[PDB]
């Protein structure tokens with residue numbers, strides 16, 4: 001293998017582009033220096049879906065670990081969001097459709113990603129969305145028995161409010177919430193708050209239904225009605241993915 005270009009840096013290591021000078025297989029390799037990556041390497045092998053990054057192999061070199069993965073030539077969804085504008089409504093809808101397909105799959109196999117944000121959603125040559133980075137992905141369901149979460153993790157502008165206010169919380173509603181923040185960012189090129197806390201003014205304005213303020217005023221009435229169901233403070237009264245799949249804007253035919 002031969003390292004060519006850095007594709008992003010994380011908490012433990014860095015992701016590189018490894019093109020073998022014999023097979024020419026352009027793949028992405030997370031080079032992890034130095035228990036937690038045993039669990040990461042595990043979950044990665046259970047992943048077989050078109051909207052989920054493919055885990056190829058894992059060679060070991062004493063301390064320098066390697067993680068071969070599917071390369072997304074198109075880059076990431078973050079690089080496709082124009083600051084303060086976002087992207088077109090038909091483009092945002094097609095990415096949300098693929099985001100839900102990848103999240104439904106993950107949930108069906110008892111896995112929560114725990115850090116859904118534009119930097120973890122990579123686009124291939126045909127612009128298909130793929131969910132990458134399972135360094136925070138944990139098991140929330142094993143043998144048809146759901147386990148609650150207690151560890152706080154993710155990125156503050158994308159985390160659900162229950163994650164900072166409750167000792168234990170369901171995994172799926174947290175993933176639904178972060179998808180709503182992704183859809184907000186695609187339709188308006190802006191994040192609505194630093195974190196959903198009772199100390200954050202922008203979050204309090206949203207709870208008080210002040211949709212005349214940004215970034216809500218840049219979003220159409222159809223997708224905004226979906227965001228009103230996804231960004232609900234109470235995770236029990238918050239829309240589920242099966243009910244998201246029946247929303248007017250989710251099923252609204254779009255082009256140009």
Ligand SMILES: Cc1c(Nc2ncc3cc(Cl)c(C4CCN([C@]5(C)COC[C@@H]5O)CC4)cc3n2)cnn1[C@@H]1CC1(F)F
Pocket residue numbers: 007008009010011015028030069070071072073074075076119120122132133
């Ligand atoms: C071809 C390309 C990519 N492709 C790519 N492919 C696979 C990736 C896999 C992972 Cl895990 C990753 C990681 C994904 C997660 N991140 C973070 C930890 C998330 O936020 C902070 C890090 O960026 C690191 C790389 C990246 C991959 N990238 C990316 N850029 N570019 C070039 C610009 C361009 F499009 F021309």
